[PDB]
């Protein structure tokens, strides 16, 4: 609503396809807009994403029911077809509903088992995820995490690597290996790419090789390679509004399928360790570079500074300060 | 208080008389103003309705006591008489209190077992309720319902009749039978009147005839509604009264009267409760929370909305800007 | 931070010294600023009081860990020494931390068993409390009371004497005439003359600390009432109480104070508006002769230029 056109015109994940099943009604919130998500009882029916608002008298359509490939609002029973047009008004069953009688519909695309939404007119496509079609990679999904922090602070914390030995001790690092190597960062028209850097953990030694790339500011493609196992993930942040976010991960890996529950637990521990910091930080919104006291930057922050720099040019004013 | 003068100079119910016993101290809220209502320990004492504020040091007078026909603020024990004029300060008991030690008082009338209050000069009368004095009619009162919606939304839902087959399915209709007949709506000198309209009720007792309900209602005031319901062998009338707490919050009460057997009173209360709670579910979710008058897309109107539309037009005529958008 | 300079440059109690143990990290809130209060593990190490803020990425340092005379940010492990200078950045262990890597520190002193804080520059000293040096007097501390009231309303209720017979009936008065009162506002601050209740008087050298004296037919009890201004609309109340009667009456003294206190708090929580009205709920305050001390306090605050927590 008060978000910049550059965010309104991008794709974001609002749900996993698994939490929307045939006949269901679910709700989401994206950039200050309340959304209703529904499908027909039909197997493989498409997913509609609309503003959660019946235009007759302002009741949430989410409180309605799916019946006969239509969503029926629960106040006066108007029925809206899959295109959002009202097709039956029960008070006047032979009146053709006025043209006005139409739900606000949004672009929706199902990809990687994720439900993607764009509130405006999409200028880019949904980010790539090459491993999706690779049969030697297994896949899994975290649950969704509600976070009381800017979406841009969520991504800022995910781009920050020097904190691993301190809040992620025992999984991504340890206090006896806290020094950070030179980090190569490039911001270009592709997006922000951080070059391969090395993580101490639990083939030369107890370390891993990681890189990541952001084609868009709220979706991150990460890669980590162990001795004989590669894991990749798509991290994707729902910007609920300027101060609140949903975090989800799609995770694929080419090692044993027995690692799934271990990966799920590792992510849950790391995410919760991050949330404790994120909820604590002030200000709530992500501070941008100088064009309480101003944020200080040392060399291991060069990727975080590049992110703030990239947001400034991108003209992001929403959820930042 | 940002309430329009139209609203300020009208009467509203803030309590049931039977809940304000002699010697009692009650609180309420009306149009953004906090109120204290207190009575003398004497039988048949009048009710005083004042702003709940001691102007000495800003404590609520409702936290004090009633004694010797005065309200006493507990902080320093200043004593306020029926007219609000403080008559004694215990720290200087032979001194005459300053003339500014005066409670802000309001107009109060008891009518139909209800406490009516006007925070400004009461232009209008309390609405009529002709069957009050008719001894063929028994009386009962619902509980009060605190509702997180604008008072004008609460009343607009009350005027809406096309929602009966959906959120009142099982008692005021069914989805299958949902067509609405065209309605007659008048907005004259008498306020807003909806003419007689048939209501298809849902079958409960199969030994009995279909009820075949006929209703009409009038609003002389925008937050008080008089409804008349002719049944199979029973007339029921009700005065529906909406207290405007502020622009976004309301209290709903009904005074119900009927000329059938007095044994139905539990029946009637339970049936009103079930339909009120289904309306409150809808009212609590509606957006925007203030009532739109004639971000979010504007409201749509179809012919079934004739009554509602007339209500919104009436509110603009009256100049209502409080609780509306 | 939006607080007036005259308030910035005075001392306030934020804690009891016994709650600041070696190695500990605690928090407080003062004039809208959030504070961290910690000590090294060395016996007789001093108390540091900083703004609870890591300047790197805005994390509360009070979520950190005290190590080797340093406070360690939990997020990237930066270590701050007892002067609040960042001594170590673990990602660059061979690098001199830059000058801006520096905690905002404040003045702190211990006195009367309390932790006193000045967020600005200390011109006056911590108020006097003569009986502290008098070993004929035993001492005791109430618990702290968090109050949803302006600190100046809290103190105003403490300088109103006419309400004793009404909300404190049974301990402090009985239902009520008030004697002519003596109030003296000069350099010494605000002083109220000896008055019978039992004979009481009190002094405020500063606007949020009060020294009160009560003499009974057998003993003298004094107390230092020190209110913490958390913000414009919130206060912490504490009392240090000293008496020269038997040491066995500590229980009952503390029960009496707790009893009257909660009685005062019932009133304070209900008062409107929240902030104390100075002399200039919709209607204006009215004053009668027994308000002479509370009138003097409002006058004193406006001559001082207090705008925070008032009207
Ligand atoms: S509000 Fe949706 S049908 Fe009337
Ligand atoms: S505040 Fe009511 S008598 Fe003092
Ligand atoms: S936030 Fe404190 S060290 Fe980075
Ligand atoms: Fe992390
Ligand atoms: Fe209804
Ligand atoms: Fe008191």
Tab-separated table of N, CA, C and O in Angstrom, chain B residues 200-244:
chain	number	residue	atom	x	y	z
B	200	UNK	N	-39.383	-15.716	5.808
B	200	UNK	CA	-39.505	-17.184	5.756
B	200	UNK	C	-38.774	-17.730	6.963
B	200	UNK	O	-37.603	-17.525	7.041
B	201	UNK	N	-39.379	-18.249	8.008
B	201	UNK	CA	-38.528	-18.787	9.090
B	201	UNK	C	-38.238	-20.252	8.829
B	201	UNK	O	-38.846	-20.830	7.939
B	202	UNK	N	-37.321	-20.796	9.601
B	202	UNK	CA	-37.025	-22.208	9.429
B	202	UNK	C	-37.946	-23.020	10.325
B	202	UNK	O	-38.151	-22.675	11.490
B	203	UNK	N	-38.433	-24.124	9.770
B	203	UNK	CA	-39.285	-25.088	10.452
B	203	UNK	C	-38.602	-25.590	11.716
B	203	UNK	O	-37.416	-25.927	11.717
B	204	UNK	N	-39.205	-25.507	12.892
B	204	UNK	CA	-38.749	-26.239	14.058
B	204	UNK	C	-39.756	-27.307	14.463
B	204	UNK	O	-39.416	-28.490	14.497
B	205	UNK	N	-41.003	-26.916	14.744
B	205	UNK	CA	-42.020	-27.845	15.232
B	205	UNK	C	-42.846	-28.348	14.049
B	205	UNK	O	-43.585	-27.580	13.425
B	206	UNK	N	-42.748	-29.646	13.752
B	206	UNK	CA	-43.494	-30.192	12.617
B	206	UNK	C	-44.973	-30.430	12.917
B	206	UNK	O	-45.765	-30.578	11.978
B	207	UNK	N	-45.359	-30.510	14.192
B	207	UNK	CA	-46.797	-30.590	14.432
B	207	UNK	C	-47.488	-29.270	14.122
B	207	UNK	O	-48.670	-29.253	13.757
B	208	UNK	N	-46.764	-28.165	14.167
B	208	UNK	CA	-47.345	-26.816	14.018
B	208	UNK	C	-47.268	-26.279	12.603
B	208	UNK	O	-46.439	-26.709	11.834
B	209	UNK	N	-48.183	-25.374	12.241
B	209	UNK	CA	-48.324	-24.501	11.045
B	209	UNK	C	-47.004	-23.759	10.808
B	209	UNK	O	-46.188	-23.694	11.748
B	210	UNK	N	-46.612	-23.394	9.583
B	210	UNK	CA	-45.449	-22.489	9.385
B	210	UNK	C	-45.737	-21.165	10.097
B	210	UNK	O	-46.865	-20.648	9.964
B	211	UNK	N	-44.728	-20.640	10.801
B	211	UNK	CA	-44.880	-19.390	11.595
B	211	UNK	C	-45.351	-18.236	10.701
B	211	UNK	O	-46.324	-17.558	11.093
B	212	UNK	N	-44.700	-18.044	9.556
B	212	UNK	CA	-45.067	-16.949	8.629
B	212	UNK	C	-45.045	-15.607	9.362
B	212	UNK	O	-46.089	-14.966	9.541
B	213	UNK	N	-43.825	-15.217	9.697
B	213	UNK	CA	-43.379	-13.949	10.344
B	213	UNK	C	-43.600	-12.728	9.434
B	213	UNK	O	-43.403	-12.845	8.208
B	214	UNK	N	-44.138	-11.591	9.896
B	214	UNK	CA	-44.220	-10.276	9.192
B	214	UNK	C	-43.576	-9.181	10.040
B	214	UNK	O	-44.033	-8.989	11.133
B	215	UNK	N	-42.602	-8.445	9.503
B	215	UNK	CA	-41.963	-7.455	10.351
B	215	UNK	C	-42.036	-6.084	9.706
B	215	UNK	O	-42.016	-5.957	8.481
B	216	UNK	N	-41.972	-5.093	10.588
B	216	UNK	CA	-41.686	-3.727	10.177
B	216	UNK	C	-40.928	-3.049	11.313
B	216	UNK	O	-40.947	-3.517	12.457
B	217	UNK	N	-40.231	-1.960	10.992
B	217	UNK	CA	-39.517	-1.232	12.035
B	217	UNK	C	-39.441	0.251	11.701
B	217	UNK	O	-39.579	0.660	10.549
B	218	UNK	N	-39.200	1.055	12.726
B	218	UNK	CA	-38.992	2.484	12.523
B	218	UNK	C	-37.809	2.943	13.356
B	218	UNK	O	-37.628	2.479	14.482
B	219	UNK	N	-37.027	3.862	12.804
B	219	UNK	CA	-36.049	4.620	13.582
B	219	UNK	C	-36.412	6.097	13.525
B	219	UNK	O	-36.397	6.700	12.449
B	220	UNK	N	-36.695	6.677	14.686
B	220	UNK	CA	-36.906	8.111	14.800
B	220	UNK	C	-35.609	8.859	15.061
B	220	UNK	O	-35.567	10.080	14.894
B	221	UNK	N	-34.731	8.119	15.745
B	221	UNK	CA	-33.343	8.420	16.184
B	221	UNK	C	-32.411	7.530	15.343
B	221	UNK	O	-32.878	6.471	14.863
B	222	UNK	N	-31.135	7.879	15.076
B	222	UNK	CA	-30.312	6.947	14.288
B	222	UNK	C	-29.727	5.777	15.068
B	222	UNK	O	-29.244	4.846	14.418
B	223	UNK	N	-29.751	5.770	16.409
B	223	UNK	CA	-29.208	4.654	17.192
B	223	UNK	C	-30.254	3.982	18.067
B	223	UNK	O	-29.910	3.280	19.029
B	224	UNK	N	-31.523	4.171	17.746
B	224	UNK	CA	-32.585	3.467	18.430
B	224	UNK	C	-33.600	3.011	17.393
B	224	UNK	O	-33.966	3.774	16.497
B	225	UNK	N	-33.976	1.750	17.486
B	225	UNK	CA	-34.852	1.111	16.496
B	225	UNK	C	-36.048	0.422	17.144
B	225	UNK	O	-35.882	-0.369	18.047
B	226	UNK	N	-37.226	0.740	16.646
B	226	UNK	CA	-38.454	0.106	17.097
B	226	UNK	C	-38.875	-0.911	16.045
B	226	UNK	O	-39.099	-0.542	14.890
B	227	UNK	N	-38.971	-2.181	16.443
B	227	UNK	CA	-39.297	-3.270	15.535
B	227	UNK	C	-40.606	-3.924	15.949
B	227	UNK	O	-40.866	-4.123	17.136
B	228	UNK	N	-41.419	-4.278	14.962
B	228	UNK	CA	-42.662	-4.982	15.235
B	228	UNK	C	-42.698	-6.248	14.396
B	228	UNK	O	-42.546	-6.182	13.172
B	229	UNK	N	-42.993	-7.367	15.068
B	229	UNK	CA	-42.932	-8.769	14.570
B	229	UNK	C	-44.275	-9.487	14.761
B	229	UNK	O	-44.660	-9.731	15.922
B	230	UNK	N	-45.174	-9.685	13.790
B	230	UNK	CA	-46.389	-10.477	13.948
B	230	UNK	C	-46.086	-11.918	13.583
B	230	UNK	O	-45.558	-12.189	12.498
B	231	UNK	N	-46.363	-12.848	14.486
B	231	UNK	CA	-46.071	-14.259	14.308
B	231	UNK	C	-47.342	-14.991	13.906
B	231	UNK	O	-48.374	-14.374	13.621
B	232	UNK	N	-47.371	-16.313	14.088
B	232	UNK	CA	-48.603	-17.113	13.841
B	232	UNK	C	-49.730	-16.725	14.808
B	232	UNK	O	-50.828	-16.436	14.369
B	233	UNK	N	-49.453	-16.745	16.092
B	233	UNK	CA	-50.522	-16.267	16.996
B	233	UNK	C	-49.836	-15.407	18.048
B	233	UNK	O	-50.061	-15.653	19.225
B	234	UNK	N	-48.935	-14.479	17.692
B	234	UNK	CA	-48.212	-13.710	18.747
B	234	UNK	C	-47.555	-12.442	18.187
B	234	UNK	O	-46.806	-12.556	17.196
B	235	UNK	N	-47.813	-11.282	18.803
B	235	UNK	CA	-47.102	-10.069	18.421
B	235	UNK	C	-45.927	-9.827	19.366
B	235	UNK	O	-46.075	-9.904	20.592
B	236	UNK	N	-44.762	-9.542	18.794
B	236	UNK	CA	-43.597	-9.208	19.609
B	236	UNK	C	-42.999	-7.901	19.103
B	236	UNK	O	-42.795	-7.733	17.899
B	237	UNK	N	-42.704	-7.025	20.046
B	237	UNK	CA	-42.146	-5.716	19.745
B	237	UNK	C	-40.830	-5.595	20.490
B	237	UNK	O	-40.613	-6.229	21.528
B	238	UNK	N	-39.932	-4.779	19.957
B	238	UNK	CA	-38.708	-4.552	20.698
B	238	UNK	C	-38.170	-3.171	20.386
B	238	UNK	O	-38.352	-2.639	19.286
B	239	UNK	N	-37.527	-2.603	21.394
B	239	UNK	CA	-36.794	-1.359	21.309
B	239	UNK	C	-35.323	-1.737	21.332
B	239	UNK	O	-34.822	-2.218	22.354
B	240	UNK	N	-34.649	-1.546	20.208
B	240	UNK	CA	-33.227	-1.833	20.144
B	240	UNK	C	-32.448	-0.546	20.318
B	240	UNK	O	-32.644	0.417	19.576
B	241	UNK	N	-31.520	-0.593	21.248
B	241	UNK	CA	-30.850	0.623	21.655
B	241	UNK	C	-29.339	0.360	21.653
B	241	UNK	O	-28.872	-0.622	22.249
B	242	UNK	N	-28.608	1.251	20.987
B	242	UNK	CA	-27.175	1.199	20.711
B	242	UNK	C	-26.481	2.318	21.468
B	242	UNK	O	-26.838	3.494	21.340
B	243	UNK	N	-25.640	2.105	22.461
B	243	UNK	CA	-24.869	3.163	23.092
B	243	UNK	C	-23.608	3.411	22.276
B	243	UNK	O	-22.838	2.476	22.062
B	244	UNK	N	-23.361	4.622	21.807
B	244	UNK	CA	-22.091	4.892	21.114
B	244	UNK	C	-20.953	5.173	22.094
B	244	UNK	O	-20.788	6.311	22.531
